[PDB]
Design a protein around this ligand. Structure first.
Ligand code: HEM
Ligand code: HEM
Ligand code: HEM
Ligand SMILES: [Ca+2]
Ligand SMILES: [Ca+2]
Ligand SMILES: [Ca+2]
Ligand SMILES: [Cl-]
Ligand SMILES: [Cl-]
Ligand SMILES: [Cl-]
Ligand SMILES: [Cl-]
Ligand SMILES: [Cl-]
Ligand SMILES: [Cl-]
Ligand SMILES: [Cl-]
Ligand SMILES: [Cl-]
Ligand SMILES: [Cl-]
Lengths: 158, 158, 158, 158, 158, 158, 158
């Protein structure tokens, strides 16, 4: 049986990951319908990565004899490519902060395996952040139109 | 641009499908940790099927120039195998009813392609219901213990 | 042109075989919907075997310049696994008796090739009976619940 | 549990499909013994297609908690190739009419999945009718003898 | 023999589909000679899809004992990429409307298989419309020049 | 050492089978020179089947310590396709009768293995008769000219 | 930029080729529904060949800075196999005449590449004519019924 405080931090992470799943998937479908099929494929992949994170969190909570809360998911959606990237980045920044605090809480309470899980999430999060910051830097340098064109497919593909 | 009433019925279905995704996936992890790895694999597959349904609903709403609502997901969880099956079945019964009413609404408003989508969902739902009713009938006949054993793997598998 | 008495015995066998086809196939679908998918597959195979018997009977009647009577099919259906097996067994017992009398009638009338056909049916029938008696003996020894479990598949199969 | 009226329409279709199975199979054996082995192979295939229809009807009735009636099968048999085709066509015309009325009954009662099954049967039936009308048109144009020759194999085949 | 009103709706659809074939193929050749070889390939594919639609309509009219009218084809041609897409989209909008009215006419007259054909056309039409609206949205976002470049091949290809 | 009466019945069958070999082979060569190469191939196959029958009869007679009589072979030859088929059929009718009487003689004398050999010959004979009656029925229905054409090859074959 | 007179001759050929496409395709579907599936396949192939001709004409007109006229297509349809062949032949005779005059016009005006295109069409046309005259000669010699039978498939094919 796990610490109530640790289970609570795991559920907070689960809430964020479920929100990230929905936001990334909505962005995938919006981007696809706008014609940015290449970037859309990446957002789909990012959504599926957050799905695996939520699964690991659920698995850990059950092992600790807690109750995973999937009953709740706030979503930030953009109207253009730049706002989609910035919304994803904002969510990753919020997740990183939550996991950094959760890591310390698990460390102080002696739940080192749960600490290890948050460390893994932290490493994954900054990998996400590095990619998104790079894409936003590229968009700023070549312009949103050229960034959109680069991430759109020609009419005869697929 | 689609009818507001049709978009609203599509969003109601999306809310149910997102709830079904979470419930099926939670059941998959609960069943797996209880040792019912075979039934757990099926619940995982059912979750992924509802994921595809939610994707089709999102896609249709966007095409109709509406806004998909993923910001919301009620979850019914069981404490044993029988209650897990009955909770899944209850959700499918509720989904079938919603889709049957939505089909008629789309028909009367002349949105026949959205009607076709609800018809496809209805056919899928009763396929789910047929399977679940069969499993619950089998459980009643051979008993919950034997049903659990039949859907558990030996210790050396995987 | 064949003996009227032989043609009549061939049509009596055809009536029984068509009844066996329908009974076995109904049992296949009932057993499948109850969750006994393994035994259901066997009943399907048994139905198809009786289908081939009916075909041979039709073929022989036509060669004898008679008229096959497919216009008629009595069906005995069970409510549980044991009654399904006992109903199949009862039909096979009735078929064996009919074929044993038909064999002698063909022998006395000098239609030895039609006699040979009934001998083949007799050998097939007692093969059916041997299998069914064995299954009913197993059910009695291990119990109907365990017999049902043994002939049911786990939820994730197929 | 399904509507009694829907179950009754499903059983009426089952009666027709079982009749079509027997008629097509008898025609297959008659045509084969007359030497029209090519057309005979097609009638065999048509019989097996109606067998699959009867299976789907049985499956649907069981899912609706009704009792499939296989205890009954009227057969129309011809004495030449043209009458065989016309008898098959007559049965398909009768089946189409039954399914068209059954479709409307299921629609009014809100059993849309059963409606979908009758729609599938209707599409299959008119596919049968199109083929049979074409064969009868060809027979009229080139004559019954040439039609028979075209659908007979030489003595050394198979 | 089919309803005169249904045959008339099928011929109206045939007129539209034949017009769409010619318009899409002309656009394919115009776009190819302008250097937009990628989009040109898609327009060629769209033309061939409408060719298959016209074939299904002809086939249905003949089965209903009507006379397909191929003696007639109005064509809207653009002078740049955007006007080509908008002309295709306009034709698809007109086809969708015709098929939606034809579906209802077939439903009221009890020709459900012809209704099914218009439903299939409707689903195909909105698939066309979804693609074209997406391409026009992309063109608006990245500009006609970049859209043209994205759908043009370099000088050494093929 | 076998019964003289059984050996005599085996030699009577051998005389008939040797006659059938020669008649079928002569028919094969006549039909081939008339241009009915397809039917000719079948007559060749039938001749070779009767050759195997004669071999089994010789083998059985030797095992019974009798002397096979191959020193004798009456042949019925036709002048057209129909008379060839009718002559073959007449011989098979005569063989069937001989084997039916021989079967009973072996049964009464207790030579059950020789009885089994005549039963095998009887089954083979009625297979021959079924084929020949079918071909003669086909010839009557489509006419001798069309039957001949169906069983003739074009000038460039082989 | 091309001669107006040459562009006009190219558009006249395009009108004829589009008419030939529709006539051949209608004949393909009529012949198929009458049961002449073999000849129907050839008419389908002929239709597709005229489709390629129309494409080459469109391509040449665009290269000459003219406007292809696809807005227009007269169709001659038969009621039996012979009239179908004669209608196709009549159209090919009319096309040959048009192309022979167009060739001379291009020659006199010094547009030798357009002349080359009409020469290619002329060679193709007389290939069509040779085939059609041969088929009509065969039909006259063996009769329309036997010609129809030769170009019909047995009921079990495809
Ligand atoms: C509790 C929430 C969710 C969980 C735990 C979850 C989990 C998963 C997992 C583990 C996979 C396997 C990935 C793979 O096979 O590569 C997956 C796939 C997938 N998920 Fe999610 N997911 C969730 C929510 C969603 C949502 C909201 C959608 C919206 C459409 C969605 C759509 C998909 C799709 C389309 C796939 C791919 C399946 C396929 O390609 O056949 N999922 N999910
Ligand atoms: C006169 C009655 C019948 C005759 C003569 C008959 C004959 C046959 C034969 C010879 C086969 C081939 C078996 C094989 O391919 O392994 C077959 C297959 C089959 N039959 Fe029957 N049958 C009859 C009635 C029925 C009925 C009442 C049903 C009810 C559903 C049925 C369902 C099937 C099915 C599903 C198959 C398998 C076909 C496939 O897998 O594609 N048959 N039948
Ligand atoms: C301007 C008029 C037309 C043009 C330029 C045209 C052009 C073409 C071309 C170039 C092909 C490729 C042939 C191949 O892949 O072997 C084709 C195929 C085809 N066309 Fe046409 N065509 C026209 C009208 C029609 C019409 C009126 C029909 C009526 C149904 C039709 C039906 C087809 C079909 C069924 C195919 C085969 C496609 C497949 O098998 O996937 N076309 N057409
Ligand atoms: Ca015996
Ligand atoms: Ca409908
Ligand atoms: Ca020259
Ligand atoms: Cl989308
Ligand atoms: Cl778990
Ligand atoms: Cl079932
Ligand atoms: Cl037969
Ligand atoms: Cl004649
Ligand atoms: Cl071009
Ligand atoms: Cl010879
Ligand atoms: Cl003939
Ligand atoms: Cl057709």
């Amino acid at each position: 049986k796990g610490e109530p405080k640790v289970i609570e931090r795991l559920n907070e992470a689960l809430l964020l990951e479920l929100g990230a799943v929905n936001q990334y998937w909505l962005h995938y479908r919006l981007l696809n319908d706008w014609g940015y099929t290449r970037l859309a494929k990446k957002e789909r992949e990012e959504s599926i990565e957050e799905m695996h994170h939520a699964d690991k969190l659920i698995d850990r909570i059950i092992f600790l004899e807690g109750f995973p809360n999937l009953q709740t998911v706030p979503l930030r959606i953009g109207q253009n490519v730049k706002e989609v990237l910035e919304a994803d980045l904002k969510g990753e920044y919020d997740a990183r902060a939550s996991y950094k605090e959760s890591r310390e809480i698990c460390d102080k309470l002696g739940d080192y395996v749960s600490k290890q899980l948050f460390d893994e999430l932290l490493a994954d999060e900054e990998g996400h952040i590095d990619f998104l910051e790079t894409q936003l830097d590229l968009l700023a340098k070549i312009g949103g139109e050229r960034y959109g064109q680069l991430n759109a497919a020609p009419a005869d593909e697929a």
